[PDB]
């Protein structure tokens, strides 16, 4: 969370939270209504957002689903959708928290090791999350689209 | 070269070469004739070895050359053929040297970063070097087959 990140930085410098950190936390807690609403929106559009996200990903790179790809059959494509739902849940976590630390803690540490042990194309995973972000922005309010796009973009950068 | 490796070990220990290193270099210098024979055979049959291994790799993983893939296009399949040529010549260098130092230094260190930059499926490359292993073993003698297989096993494990 943003509060956790500020606390960690203050502890690292061995001091109390600065007025800038305090005002940032104050602004975040005051504006948290919009963040909770957007988390609710993404949770509601979870099923569709995953559906057309995976569809666009497969159309843009069918090799991952084609013969020889990681998720060739419907079974492994279902697993791929399961992972995409994981990452949607992580982005929801990031939106509610306000800071990317939950995302890093849950689904970005050792992710290269995971997707090199699984043989998954990490570039394909990045493209899938990018299509997720595009469809979410399409079905989300523009400014709120940017609010969620910050976390989607961070996950994209870490994946790439 | 195993001579260079033994020299490095001896200089690290600040001592002259031990009987183990002396016996190792003696065995290498006595087997240099067979090693050069294997190198000459690989150099002579390089193109057929690489082409057959690449086609076996294509059959294993058709998506590598499928549309939207890294090898898609005749340019991007000829570049796979070139990479396989590079790795076969590197294996020849390692066989003639007796140690894996040239292989690790020219094709193994930084290879994962290079293939991450280029988007290549290093697992697919490992399958390709495996197929080159079977093809070279078929084209090559049985007694030296184990010797060449050791270096192929090393490369497959490292680049896996």
């Amino acid at each position: 969370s943003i509060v956790t990140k500020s606390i960690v930085n203050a502890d690292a410098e061995a001091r109390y939270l600065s007025p800038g950190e305090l005002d940032r936390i104050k602004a975040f807690v005051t504006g948290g209504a919009a963040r909770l609403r957007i988390a609710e929106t993404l949770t509601g559009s979870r099923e569709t957002i995953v559906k057309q996200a995976g569809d666009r990903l497969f159309q843009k790179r069918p090799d991952i689903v084609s013969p020889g790809g990681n998720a060739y059959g419907e079974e492994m494509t279902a697993t791929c959708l399961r992972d995409m739902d994981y990452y949607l849940r992580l982005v929801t976590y990031g939106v509610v928290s306000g800071d990317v630390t939950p995302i890093e803690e849950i689904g970005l540490v050792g992710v290269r090791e995971m997707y090199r042990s699984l043989g998954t194309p990490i570039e394909a995973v990045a493209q899938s999350v990018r299509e997720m972000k595009e469809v979410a922005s399409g079905l989300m309010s523009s400014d709120d689209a940017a609010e969620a796009s910050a976390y989607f973009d961070f996950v994209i950068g870490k994946m790439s | 070269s195993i001579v260079t490796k033994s020299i490095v070990n001896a200089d690290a220990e600040a001592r002259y070469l031990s009987p183990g290193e002396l016996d190792r270099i003696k065995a290498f210098v006595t087997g240099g004739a067979a090693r050069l024979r294997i190198a000459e055979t690989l150099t002579g049959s390089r193109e057929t070895i690489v082409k057959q291994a690449g086609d076996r790799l294509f059959q294993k993983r058709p998506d590598i050359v499928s549309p939207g893939g890294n090898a898609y296009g005749e340019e991007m399949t000829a570049t796979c053929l070139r990479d396989m040529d590079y790795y076969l010549r590197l294996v020849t260098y390692g066989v003639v040297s007796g140690d894996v130092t040239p292989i690790e230094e020219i094709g193994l260190v930084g290879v994962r970063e290079m293939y991450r930059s280029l988007g290549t499926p290093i697992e697919a490359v490992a399958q390709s070097v495996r197929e080159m292993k079977e093809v070279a073993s078929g084209l090559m003698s049985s007694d030296d087959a184990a010797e060449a297989s050791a270096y192929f096993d090393f490369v497959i494990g490292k680049m896996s």
Binding site: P67, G68, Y72, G73, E75, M76 | Q59, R61, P62
Partner: peptide
């Protein structure tokens, strides 16, 4: 020609 699902 196939890949085990």
């Amino acid at each position: 020609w196939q890949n085990e699902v």
